[PDB]
C-alpha cells in the first residue's frame, strides 16, 4: 500500500549526500586529450577519459582551417556554421550505458538554452573600455573568398551532470576495469561544404565555391570536469545514489510525413522526463523564419493544447529564455520546471501544423531528458 | 497579529500548492484584423477558466506613407504606441490595470530586466539574431513606401510566474471579464515636424499623408488549470486573489526652473515602481533639462537624491540599458512605497529648463487590496 | 563546537537588519579641479548607520592641443581616470587598496557584464546609450576637446544582500577616509611606443594633451534606522568583523615556457583573481601565453587551461572578454584558502616574454579583522 | 459490484423522474449578424438554468460572387461548412464537444436516421415539400449573383431527448458556460479549382472574387425546468450528470497502397460512432480508392471487414442514404468500442490508391466520465 515513505526518504538522503559532496569535494577541469588531424584521412575518434571521482561533463574545443580553393566563387556560413564542426557525439559510461547521443548542432543549441544566451558569445555594449570579442572563443569568418583560408573555433559542453549544482546524471568513474568512452564524429570534406541548392543542414559553409573547399586541418582538445577528493563517512563514500543512477541525456531523431494544414504530431515516449524539446523544420533544404508554419503546440491525449501558438508568439517565449531567436526554422520549448512525463498525464505529443511543405520535408527533433538507469 | 502571520503563512502554502499541482496553459482567446479608420476600440472577452495570470497581446500593423516626397521616422516610443490604452475588469467588474501602451511596455521591460522580448546582439557566428522579428518596426518609412510592424504587450494580473498576487479566479460561468484595447489611429500615430511625439509611432515631414492600412491583434490568455482540491474544496491563496496588482498613469503640470516639483504618492497603495516621463513641451531630453530626481519623505529627507546620470546608472543595473530620452525609472520592489509606514512620500524632479506646456507623465505599478 | 550558532545568529541578524533598516544613497562630496595643481583627495564620508559602499562619479574634459596629431583610447580608457583608491574605516583599519582599473574590472565581474554598460539589442523602441553613463570618445583629434564620464563602486559590503565587509559607523565617531588618486597630465597620455597600461589615451599627439579639468562626486550608500532589540542594536557580528577587500600587486621574473607562479597568502579567502600580462608594454590576446592555471603544492593543477578555454570560462561570468592581456578567475563558491602561505598559486606559463614583462595581480578577498 | 448495480438503478430512476416531472423548454439565448471579414469567432454565454440538454444553432448567410464571368458550385459539404468549429465548456470549465461543423452535422444526421432537418421528396399532391428552406443553399452562384444560405446544427450535451447522459446541471449563478462558435470567412469558404474543397462551401473558377456579405446566428438553448425535489433536495441522475458526451475530430496521415492503415482508438472512452473521411489529397472518391474498411481488435480478428459498397450498405440502413463522397460511417451505439473490454481496437482502411497529401479525418462520438 503506502510505504512510499521510502521514496520520500530516498530523495532526502540523495539531496543531503549531493550537498555534502558539493561542499566537501573540489572541482577540477583537466585536459585529457588533444589531436590535430586531416579530415581526408580520418574524422571519427573515440576518446578515453580518465576514471577519477564523479564526472560532470566535458568541454570540447575544436579549431579548424578551411581553404576555399575555387578559382572564382566564395562560400558563406550556413545558419549553423561552426556548430557543425562536430557531426555527432556519443558518450558511454563505465558500465557501457549510453548517455548523450546527438548531433553537434543539437548539443550546441542546448548549451545555449542552458546558458540563457548564445553559448560562450560576447555581447555587444556601449562600453568605452575595450571589452568585446577579444579572444574569439567561438568564431568563424562569415565568408571565405576564392583562394582564401578561414580559421574557426567552436566549443561544446557535453553534459553528464545536469548542472554545476544538480548532479543528476553525473557519472561515478572509479572502476579501473572499464573505461568511459566519448565518441566524436567530426565534419569532413563531404559534410562541411554544401553546393548552391543543396541542403545546408549539416554543412558549415555553402556557396558556389563549395566543391573546391577543403579542410587544411581540424584540431580538438577534450577537457574533463569532475569532482575529486570525495567525502567519506561511517558507511564509506557519501554519494547521491539517485543522481548517480539517473541518466541525463540529449538525443535527436527525424520524422517525415508532413502535409499542408494538417497537424504533424511527434509523440513523446513514456518513462523519459523531457526537460526541453527542439524542433527543426528542414523544409526540403529550405529553412524559413516561421512563414511555412501555421502554429506549433504541445498536446495531451484530450485534444488539449497547453501552448498552441503562432510562430512569432512561440518565438517570443524563446526570446525570454535565450534573449534572442534560434536560427531560421529552429524552434525551442522549455519544460524544465514541469518535465513532460507520459505517466503524469496521457501520451503527449509535440505538434507542428505546416502552412507550406516542400519535397523531402522533415522535422528534426532534439530532446533533453532524465531517465532511470534501470 | 497572530491571525495575520498565520493568514500569510496559509496564503503562501496555498500559492505553493496551486503552482505545484496545476498546469499552466496559454491559449488564443481572440484575433481580429481591422482598419483603425473604421474602428479602434475593442472589448475582448477572456475565457472564464481557473486562475488567470495575464494576457499576451500580439499586435501587427501595416503603415503607408503616401507623401509625395517626405519620409517619417520612428518616435522614441515607436511601436509601443500601437496600443494607446489598455483597461482590464475582472468578473466582479473591479478594475485592475488601466494605463497607456507605452507605460505597460516600459513595465514589461523593467520586469524582464532588458528591453521586452528584444534580441541581444552578440559576436556569435551561429545565426542567432533577429530571425523572427517579434517586436519590430522600420526605422523610417519613405515617401511611397509601406512598413510592417509587430509589437507585443503582456497585461499582468498576477505579479509574476511564481507570485500569484493580483491573479484572478475566473470560474463563475455568467460573470465575464473585460479586456479593453484602444488602438492607435491616423490621428495618434503620426506627428508632424515640431508636434509632440509622445503618443505617436512615426514623426516627420511626410506625416500628414501617412495612413494605417490595417492593424491586427491576437490575445493569448495565460492561466492555471486543474486547480488542486482539498478538504474544503479548492486550495487557494486568499490574499493573492483578493489583492489587485495594477498599472496606472497620470499627468502632472506646474514645473518651474530650479524648483522642486513634487508628485505625492497620493494613495495608500504599495508602489512597486514609478516611471516619470519629462515631456518638456514636446521635447524629450537626455537628462540635460534636469538638475536632479529623488524620492523624499515628509521628514524632508531624500533616500536617493541623484543627478540624472547617476539616476540612469541605477536603471542600467535594472534593465541593462537606458530607457528612451526623458523617461526615468525607479525600482521600489523589495520595499514598496507605502505612506502608512512613513510620512507621505513624494517623487521629486528639480528641472533645469522648463518649456511651455511642460509636464511629468507618471506611471505607477502597485498592489492594493480589493477591500 | 559553537560557530554553527554564531553563524546562524549572524545570518539571522543580517536578515533582520536588511528587513528593518532603510537603504539610502546620499551625496557626500563634489569637487572640480585641475590636475596640474592637485590630483589626490581624501574624502570624508558621513558616520551614519551601516555603510555598504561608495559610488564615485568622475567627469573630465581632455584637450588635445597638438597641432596635427590625434590620440585614441587605450584598452582601459576612462577606467584609468582614477589611478588608485584606499579606504580606512573608523578604527583605522584599511579595507580596499587597489588601482582604478582593477576596481573597475571587479565591478564588472560582480555585475556579470561590463559595469554600467548599455547592451545593444534589435529593439525598435529607442532604448540604448541615451545617458552616456560610462563614456569616452574613441579618439580626440588635434585641437579637439573630449568629454568623459566614469563610475566606480568602492565596496565595503560584499553585495546588496550579503553584508560581509560592511562598516558600522553610526557610532565610531572617529572619521573614515576614502582616498582617491586621479589621473594627471603625466599618467593619462601615452606617446606612441610607450606603455599604455595606466593611460587613458595614446597616440602621436599625446605630448600635447592635457586635462581642461576633472570633477568627482562621491555618493555614500548605507542602511539607516537600524533595528533595536533587547541587548540593543541587532547586528551581524561576523559580517561587521570581516573585511571584504580588493588589493593589487606586481610580480616580475617571467621566462619563456617556464611556469611563473604567484603564491596566494594564507588567512585570506580569495574570491577572485585578475592577472594582467603587461608584456613589456604590449598587451596580447592570449597569443603570448601557453596556459594559465591555479595549482596546489602536491595536488597539481585544478584548472590548467589554454588561453581561449580560460577565456571561455570568463565569458560565462561577464558575457564577453576582458580587454587584451587581462585574465580573470572566479573562486567565489569555493574561495582559495590555505592555512600555509602559498599552499596554492596562480600560474602563467608564457610563450613570449618581452623586456620589462610583469604580471599585475588583482585580488578580491575576505579576512578576519582579528 | 452491488454498489454499482444499485448506483445505476438509482441513476435511471432519477432520470425517469426528472423527465416525468420537469418541463422541456427551448429559448433563444443570443442572436448576432456580422461580416466575417470583421470578426468570425464568437463566445456565446448560455443561460444558467436547470439541466441543459443542448443548443440548436441557426446560421444564415448571404454570399456574392463578383467574378467577371465564372461561377462557383457547392462543395460536397456545402453549408455544413458555415461553422468551422464549435467548442463547449460547462460551468466547471470542463470541455465537452470540440469538433468541426461538418463532423457535428454528420452526427446530427446519424442520430436523426436521415439527412438532418431535410425535406423528403414524395408523390404527394398536397403541397408538402421544401416550403420553409430550413437547411438550404443554392447549387451554384453565378458571376454577379448573390445566394442565400440557411444551416442548422444541434450541439448536444445530453445524448438524446430520453437519455440524459452528458447533460449539464447549470444552477450556479456565478459560473458561466461557454459555447464558442468559429465561423467560415472568405478564406475558408471559397476554393479555387484544383484546391482542396474539404472546408469550403463553394468551389469554382469564380472563387477568388467571392465574398460573404453577412452571416447571422441565433442560438437556442434546450433545457429542463422545474426540476423535481425530494427528500434530499433535487432528484438527479448522478451518473448522467457526471458523464461527458462529446464529439471530437483529428487527422491521421501515413497511408500507402494496399497496406492496412490502422487508427487506434487511443483513449479509454466508450466510442459510440466513428466517421472516417478519406481526403485523398483534395480528391473525394466514392469508394473507388479503397479496398476495404474494418474495425479490428488486438486479437487481429475483424468484426466487420467490408468492401466499400457493403460498408455503404450498412450505412444506408442507418441514414436511409449515403454520406457524401469519401465519408464513411460506423455505428457502435449498442456496443460502444471500449478498449478495456477487449484488446486495443483500431479503425482500419486499406487504400487502393493514395495521392500526395492523403489523410484520414477521424470524427468520434463518445462517453467518458468527468473523473
Grid coordinates representing B60 are 501587427
Phi, psi of B194 (to 5 degrees): 85, -10
The DSSP symbol for C175 reads P
Contact C18, C161 (CB under 8 A): yes
Rounded Cα–Cα distance for residues C127 and B114 (Å): 10
Interface test with C, best of A52, A62, A119, A127 (most C CBs within 10 A): A127
Rounded Cα–Cα distance for residues C349 and C361 (Å): 15
Chains touching chain A through at least 3 C-beta pairs below 8 angstroms are: B, C, D
- Start-end of H helices in chain D: 2-21, 101-112, 186-189, 238-241, 308-319
Grid coordinates representing D128 are 408538402
Contact C336, C294 (CB under 8 A): yes
Closest CA to D17 of D281, D232, D220: D232
The DSSP symbol for C159 reads S
Contact D98, D85 (CB under 8 A): yes
Bridge-based pairing state of the strands C189-190 and C201-202: parallel
Grid coordinates representing B269 are 497603495
DSSP secondary structure, D30-76, as one string: EEEEE-TTT--EEEE-----SEEEEEEEEEEEEEEE--SS--EEE-S
Rounded Cα–Cα distance for residues D148 and D141 (Å): 10
Q: Cell numbers 587598496 label which residue?
A: C97
Rounded Cα–Cα distance for residues D44 and D31 (Å): 9
Chain D residue whose CA is closest to A348: D266
Taking CB atoms and an 8 Å limit, are D251 and A263 in contact across chains?
A: yes
All residues of chain B having their beta carbon less than 8 Å from the beta carbon of residue A309 are 26, 28, 220
All residues of chain B having their beta carbon less than 8 Å from the beta carbon of residue C27 are 305-306
Asked: is B231-371 a CATH 2.60.120.20 domain? The reply is: yes
Other residues' Cβ atoms within 10 Å of the Cβ of residue D371 = 4
Phi, psi of B35 (to 5 degrees): -110, 120
Contact D219, D203 (CB under 8 A): no
Rounded Cα–Cα distance for residues C13 and B147 (Å): 59
Q: Cell numbers 536603471 label which residue?
A: B315
The DSSP symbol for C265 reads P
Rounded Cα–Cα distance for residues B56 and B26 (Å): 9
Closest CA to A140 of A159, A155, A153, A123: A153
Contact D359, D279 (CB under 8 A): yes
Q: Cell numbers 592570449 label which residue?
A: C286
Grid coordinates representing A128 are 568605452
Per-residue b or e along B256-278, where b marks 16 or more CB atoms closer than 10 Å to that residue's CB: eeeebbbbebeeebbbbbbbbbb
Rounded Cα–Cα distance for residues A155 and A63 (Å): 9
Distance of CA B96 to the CA centre of its chain: 13
List % helix, strand, coil for chain B (3-state, nearest 5): 15, 45, 40
Rg (CA), chain B: 22
Contact A53, A167 (CB under 8 A): no
First to last CA, chain C: 20
Chains touching chain C through at least 3 C-beta pairs below 8 angstroms are: A, B
Rounded Cα–Cα distance for residues D256 and C124 (Å): 50
Chain A residue whose CA is closest to B108: A320
Tell me the torsion sign for CA atoms C323, C327, C332, C337: negative
In SS3 terms, A165-181 reads as CCCCCCEECCCCCCCCE
Nearest C-alpha of chain B: how many angstroms from D9? 29
For chain A, the residues whose C-beta falls within 8 A of a C-beta of chain C are 26-31, 59, 61, 115, 117, 120-137, 153, 155, 221, 223
Rounded Cα–Cα distance for residues A244 and D176 (Å): 51
In SS3 terms, chain A reads as CCCCHHHHHHHHHHHHHHHHHHHHCEEEEEEEEEEEECCCCCCEEEECCCCCCEEEEEEEEEEEEEEECCCCCCEEECCCHHHHCEEEEEEECCCCCEEEEEEHHHHHHHHHHHHCCCCCCCECECCCCCCECCCCCCECCCEECCCCEEEEEEEEEEECCCCCCCCCCCEECCCCCCCCEEEEEECCCCCCEECCCCCCCCCCEECCCHHHEEEEEEEEEEEEEEEECCCEECCEECCCCCHHHEEEEEEEEEECCCCCCCCEEEECCCCCEEEEEEEEEEECCECCCCCCEEEEEEEECCCEECCCECHHHHHHHHHHHHCCECCCCEEEEECCCCCECCCCCCCEEEEEEECCCCCCEEEEEEEEEEEECC
DSSP secondary structure, C290-358, as one string: EEEEEEETTTEES--B-HHHHHHHHHHHHSSBPSTTEEEEE-SSS-B--SSTTSEEEEEEES---TTEE
Rounded Cα–Cα distance for residues A294 and A288 (Å): 12
Stated as kind and residue range, the H or E segment containing B57 is: strand B51-65
Taking CB atoms and an 8 Å limit, are C26 and B136 in contact across chains?
A: no
Grid coordinates representing B4 are 495575520
Grouping H, G, I as helix, E, B as strand and the rest as coil, residue C273 is strand
Bridge partners of C252, per DSSP, are C358
Taking CB atoms and an 8 Å limit, are D253 and A262 in contact across chains?
A: yes
Nearest C-alpha of chain D: how many angstroms from B159? 24
Instruction: Provide CB contacts within 8 A for D155, sequence distance 6+.
Output: D54, D55, D56, D57, D86, D88, D97, D104, D179
The DSSP symbol for B36 reads T
DSSP secondary structure, D264-285, as one string: E--SS-EEEEEEEEEEETTB--
Other residues' Cβ atoms within 10 Å of the Cβ of residue D353 = 16
Q: What angle do CA D132, D136, D137 make, to 5 degrees?
A: 140
Rounded Cα–Cα distance for residues A212 and B38 (Å): 60
DSSP secondary structure, D229-257, as one string: EETTEE---HHHHTEEEEEEEEEEE---T
Q: Which of D98, D266, D357 lies at the smallest CB-CB distance from A260?
A: D357
**Domain spans in chain D, listed from the N-terminal domain onward:** 3-230, 231-371
Per-residue b or e along C34-46, where b marks 16 or more CB atoms closer than 10 Å to that residue's CB: ebeeebeeebebb
Rounded Cα–Cα distance for residues B50 and B52 (Å): 6
- CATH code for the part of the protein at C2-229: 2.70.9.30
Q: Which of A259, A263, A346 lies at the smallest CB-CB distance from D357?
A: A259
Taking CB atoms and an 8 Å limit, are B172 and D170 in contact across chains?
A: no
The DSSP symbol for B311 reads H
- Maximum distance among all Cα pairs of chain A, rounded to whole angstroms: 77
Nearest C-alpha of chain C: how many angstroms from B285? 9
Rounded Cα–Cα distance for residues D82 and D99 (Å): 13
Contact D305, D297 (CB under 8 A): no
Distances (CA, A) of A366 to A97, A350, A363, D272: 20, 11, 10, 39
Q: What angle do CA D177, D181, D185 make, to 5 degrees?
A: 165
The DSSP symbol for B340 reads T
Rg (CA), chain A: 22
Q: Which of D250, D253, D267 lies at the smallest CB-CB distance from A257?
A: D253
Q: What angle do CA A91, A95, A98 make, to 5 degrees?
A: 30
Taking CB atoms and an 8 Å limit, are D359 and A263 in contact across chains?
A: no
Rounded Cα–Cα distance for residues A258 and A256 (Å): 6
Decide which of 2.70.9.30, 2.40.50.140, 3.30.70.1050, 3.90.79.10 is the CATH code for B3-230.
2.70.9.30
Grouping H, G, I as helix, E, B as strand and the rest as coil, residue B236 is coil
Rounded Cα–Cα distance for residues B357 and B279 (Å): 8
Grid coordinates representing B253 are 503640470
Chain A residue whose CA is closest to B161: A337
Grid coordinates representing B243 are 489583492
Bridge partners of C292, per DSSP, are C305, C348
Per-residue b or e along B337-350, where b marks 16 or more CB atoms closer than 10 Å to that residue's CB: bbbeeeeebbbbbb
Contact C209, C63 (CB under 8 A): yes
Closest CA to D206 of D292, D140, D129, D265: D140
Q: Which of B45, B174, B175 lies at the smallest CB-CB distance from D43?
A: B45
Contact D243, D165 (CB under 8 A): yes
Instruction: Provide CB contacts within 8 A for C4, sequence distance 6+.
Output: none
Per-residue b or e along B157-184, where b marks 16 or more CB atoms closer than 10 Å to that residue's CB: bbbeeeebbbbbbbbbbbbbbebebbbb
Rg (CA), chain C: 22
Please indicate whether chains D and A are in contact, defined as at least 3 beta carbon pairs under 8 Å: yes
CATH architecture, range A234-374: Sandwich (2.60)
Grid coordinates representing B3 are 491571525
Grid coordinates representing D11 are 441513476
Per-residue b or e along D157-185, where b marks 16 or more CB atoms closer than 10 Å to that residue's CB: bbbeeeebbbbbbbeeeebbbbbbbbbbb
Contact A175, A94 (CB under 8 A): yes
Stated as kind and residue range, the H or E segment containing B359 is: strand B358-369
Decide which of 3.40.50.12280, 2.40.37.10, 3.30.70.3400, 2.70.9.30 is the CATH code for A6-233.
2.70.9.30
Taking CB atoms and an 8 Å limit, are C302 and A120 in contact across chains?
A: no
Phi, psi of D328 (to 5 degrees): -120, 140
Rounded Cα–Cα distance for residues D332 and D322 (Å): 18
Bridge-based pairing state of the strands D261-264 and C145-155: unpaired
Rounded Cα–Cα distance for residues B160 and B164 (Å): 6
Interface test with B, best of C122, C308, C318 (most B CBs within 10 A): C122
Distances (CA, A) of B346 to B106, B255, B323, C276: 21, 15, 22, 47
Q: Which of D38, D39, D48 lies at the smallest CB-CB distance from B173?
A: D48
Contact A54, A226 (CB under 8 A): yes
Taking CB atoms and an 8 Å limit, are A347 and D98 in contact across chains?
A: no
The DSSP symbol for B198 reads T
Asked: is C230-370 a CATH 2.60.120.20 domain? The reply is: yes
The DSSP symbol for B113 reads T
Taking CB atoms and an 8 Å limit, are A259 and D253 in contact across chains?
A: yes
Nearest C-alpha of chain A: how many angstroms from C96? 22
Grid coordinates representing A101 are 547521443
Other residues' Cβ atoms within 10 Å of the Cβ of residue A92 = 19
Grid coordinates representing A96 are 557501457
Crossing angle of helices C100-111/C307-318, nearest 10°?
Answer: 70
All residues of chain C having their beta carbon less than 8 Å from the beta carbon of residue B321 are 118-119, 121, 127-129
All residues of chain A having their beta carbon less than 8 Å from the beta carbon of residue C305 are 29, 31, 223
For chain B, the residues whose C-beta falls within 8 A of a C-beta of chain C are 74, 76-80, 105, 109, 114-116, 118-121, 129-130, 135-137, 139, 149, 286-287, 302-310, 312-313, 316-317, 319-325, 335
Tell me the torsion sign for CA atoms D75, D81, D84, D90: negative
Contact C188, C201 (CB under 8 A): yes
Rounded Cα–Cα distance for residues C284 and C324 (Å): 5
Crossing angle of helices D101-112/D308-319, nearest 10°?
Answer: 70
All residues of chain B having their beta carbon less than 8 Å from the beta carbon of residue C149 are 309
For chain A, the residues whose C-beta falls within 8 A of a C-beta of chain B are 77, 79-83, 108, 112, 117-119, 121-124, 132-133, 138-140, 142, 152, 289-290, 305-313, 315-316, 319-320, 322-328, 338
Taking CB atoms and an 8 Å limit, are A303 and D359 in contact across chains?
A: no
For chain B, the residues whose C-beta falls within 8 A of a C-beta of chain A are 23-28, 56, 58, 112, 114, 117-134, 150, 152, 218, 220
Contact A361, A156 (CB under 8 A): no
- Start-end of H helices in C21-70: none
All residues of chain A having their beta carbon less than 8 Å from the beta carbon of residue C115 are 127
Tell me the torsion sign for CA atoms B227, B231, B237, B243: positive
Bridge-based pairing state of the strands D140-141 and D95-100: unpaired
Stated as kind and residue range, the H or E segment containing C238 is: helix C237-240
Amino acid at each position: 500500500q503506502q510505504a512510499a515513505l521510502r521514496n520520500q526518504q530516498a530523495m532526502a538522503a540523495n539531496l543531503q549526500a549531493r550537498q555534502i559532496v558539493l561542499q566537501q569535494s573540489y572541482p577540477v577541469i583537466q585536459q585529457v586529450e588533444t589531436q590535430t588531424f586531416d579530415p581526408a584521412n580520418r574524422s571519427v575518434f573515440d576518446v578515453t577519459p580518465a576514471n577519477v571521482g564523479i564526472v560532470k561533463g566535458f568541454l570540447v574545443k575544436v579549431t579548424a582551417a578551411i581553404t576555399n580553393n575555387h578559382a572564382t566563387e566564395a562560400v558563406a556560413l550556413t545558419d549553423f556554421g561552426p556548430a557543425n564542426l562536430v557531426q555527432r557525439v556519443i558518450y558511454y559510461d563505465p558500465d557501457n550505458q549510453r548517455h548523450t547521443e546527438t548531433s553537434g548542432w543539437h548539443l550546441h543549441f542546448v548549451n545555449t538554452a542552458k546558458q540563457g544566451a548564445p553559448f560562450l558569445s560576447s555581447m555587444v555594449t556601449d562600453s568605452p573600455i575595450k571589452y568585446g570579442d577579444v579572444m574569439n572563443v567561438i568564431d568563424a569568418p562569415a565568408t571565405i573568398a576564392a583562394g582564401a583560408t578561414g580559421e574557426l573555433t567552436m566549443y561544446y559542453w557535453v553534459p553528464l551532470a545536469y548542472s554545476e549544482t544538480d548532479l543528476t546524471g553525473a557519472v561515478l568513474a572509479n572502476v579501473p576495469q572499464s573505461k568511459q568512452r566519448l565518441k566524436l564524429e567530426f565534419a569532413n570534406n563531404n559534410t562541411a561544404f554544401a553546393a548552391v541548392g543543396a541542403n545546408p543542414l549539416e554543412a558549415i559553409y555553402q556557396g558556389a565555391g563549395a566543391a573546391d573547399c577543403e579542410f587544411e586541418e581540424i584540431s580538438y582538445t577534450v577537457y574533463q570536469s569532475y569532482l575529486d577528493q570525495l567525502p567519506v563517512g561511517q558507511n564509506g563514500y557519501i554519494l547521491p545514489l539517485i543522481d548517480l543512477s539517473t541518466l541525463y541525456n540529449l538525443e535527436n531523431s527525424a520524422q517525415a510525413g508532413l502535409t499542408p494544414n494538417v497537424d504533424f504530431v511527434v509523440q513523446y515516449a513514456n518513462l523519459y522526463r523531457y526537460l526541453s524539446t527542439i524542433a527543426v523544420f528542414d523544409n526540403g533544404g529550405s529553412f524559413n523564419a516561421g512563414t511555412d508554419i501555421n502554429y506549433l503546440s504541445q498536446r495531451t491525449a484530450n485534444f488539449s493544447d497547453t501552448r498552441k501558438l503562432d510562430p512569432k508568439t512561440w518565438a517570443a517565449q524563446t526570446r525570454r529564455r535565450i534573449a534572442t531567436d534560434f536560427p531560421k526554422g529552429v524552434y525551442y520549448c522549455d519544460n524544465r520546471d514541469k518535465p513532460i512525463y507520459t505517466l503524469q498525464y496521457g501520451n503527449v505529443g509535440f505538434v507542428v501544423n505546416p502552412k507550406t511543405v516542400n519535397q523531402n520535408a522533415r522535422l528534426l527533433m532534439g530532446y533533453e531528458y532524465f531517465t532511470s538507469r534501470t
